Design a protein around this nucleic acid. Structure first.
Lengths: 176, 176
DNA sequence: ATGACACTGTGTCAT
DNA sequence: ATGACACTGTGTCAT
C-alpha cells in the first residue's frame, strides 16, 4: 500500500482494510473488483488509488497480513524434527491453518485461483520440488473437493508414504 | 462451438478459427478478449456469439483441436511398457509435444495460467496423483523458467528418481 | 443479422 | 481530492 494508506486514522484505515479483506474473502483475485470495494466503503474511486497502486497491491497486502506460506511451515518443522516427524506434524499444521481458521476463504482462492502472473510478482533441490508439488496438489484437492479432515489425512498419508518409501516399493514387493 | 459455426463455408470457418487460434497463441485465457478476435476478422461482435457460447467455448475448442492431454500420453505408454520404461520415454514425448511443436504457446498458457474455473469445466489413486503433481510442476518450471531440453531432462531425472526409489533412500544410505 | 444499448469496469487528469 | 472522461470490454435485443 501507499504511504497515504498508512497515514489514515485508525478508524478509516480499519474500514478500508476490512473492505479489502471482505472482497477477497468472497472473490478470487480475478473476480475481485476495485469498484466493489469503493462502493462498499461509499468513497470515490480515486481514493482507492491513493491508498493502493492497483488491485494487486491490496490483494498482496491482505495476503501478507492474513496468511502464512506453507513452505515456511514445513521448513520450520525440519529445523527441529526428522523428515518423517516433520511430515507427520505437517499435515495437522496445514489443516489448523487452512481449514480450521478464519482465513479459509483466502487460502482457497490462493490455491484454486493463482496464475504465473501472481506467482511472478508474489514475494531449489529435488526434495523440495517434489514435496512442494505433492503437498500443493493435496491442498488443491482439499479445497476443490471439499474434503473432510479425515479424507485429507488419509490421502496425505498414502501419497507421502509413496514419496518417502518410493513408488516402486509401493507397487511391488520385488526389490531394486 | 454452435451449429452455425460448423455451417460456415470452408473459407469463413477457417478465417474464424485461425483468428481464435491466433488470439490464444498470444493471450492467456484471462488476457484473451472477444473484442480482439472480431476486430481482427473485421466482423460485427454479434457474429462471434453466433459461432460460440462465449470466450471459453472458443478457448476449449482450440485446445481440444490443437493440444493433447499429457495424462493420456503417459497412461498410453503404461499399456505397452514398464513404469520405469514409460517414465524414460515420457520425458522425451513431453518435450516433443510441449516445446518442439507449433502448439508451444498454447501449452504455455495452459500450464502457467489455468484456474479451478477452467479445470472444473474442462473435459484416482496415489500413484497417479503423485506422478501428476511432480510432472505438472516440472512442466510449469519448463515454461516459467524457459528451460532448455537438457535442463528439463536433468531435473525430471532427479525428481522422478526421488519419486521412484523414494525420498528417504535419496537422502540417506540408512535402510528402512 | 448486427450495432446500438445498458452494463460494468479501469486508470487518469483537471480541479 | 474526486468525479468526469476516455477507454476497453460483455452480452442482448430490436430489427
Amino acid at each position: 500500500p501507499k504511504s497515504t494508506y498508512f497515514s489514515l486514522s485508525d478508524e478509516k484505515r480499519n474500514r478500508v482494510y476490512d473492505a479489502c479483506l471482505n472482497e477477497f474473502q468472497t472473490h478470487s483475485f480475478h473476480e475481485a473488483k476495485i469498484m466493489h470495494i469503493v462502493k462498499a466503503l461509499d468513497i470515490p474511486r480515486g481514493s482507492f488509488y491513493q491508498y493502493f497502486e492497483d488491485l494487486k497491491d491490496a490483494y498482496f497486502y491482505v495476503l501478507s497480513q492474513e496468511t502464512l506460506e506453507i513452505h515456511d511451515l514445513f521448513f520450520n518443522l525440519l529445523k527441529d524434527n526428522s523428515i518423517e516427524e516433520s511430515l507427520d506434524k505437517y499435515k495437522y499444521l496445514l489443516l489448523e491453518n487452512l481449514i480450521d481458521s478464519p482465513q479459509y476463504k483466502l487460502y482457497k482462492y490462493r490455491f484454486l485461483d493463482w496464475t504465473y502472473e501472481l506467482e511472478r510478482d508474489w514475494k531449489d533441490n529435488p526434495i523440495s520440488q517434489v514435496l512442494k508439488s505433492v503437498v500443493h496438489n493435496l491442498v488443491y484437492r482439499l479445497f476443490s473437493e471439499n474434503w473432510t479432515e479425515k479424507t485429507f489425512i488419509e490421502n496425505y498419508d498414502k501419497e507421502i508414504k509413496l514419496v518417502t518409501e518410493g513408488l516402486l516399493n509401493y507397487i511391488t514387493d520385488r526389490k531394486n
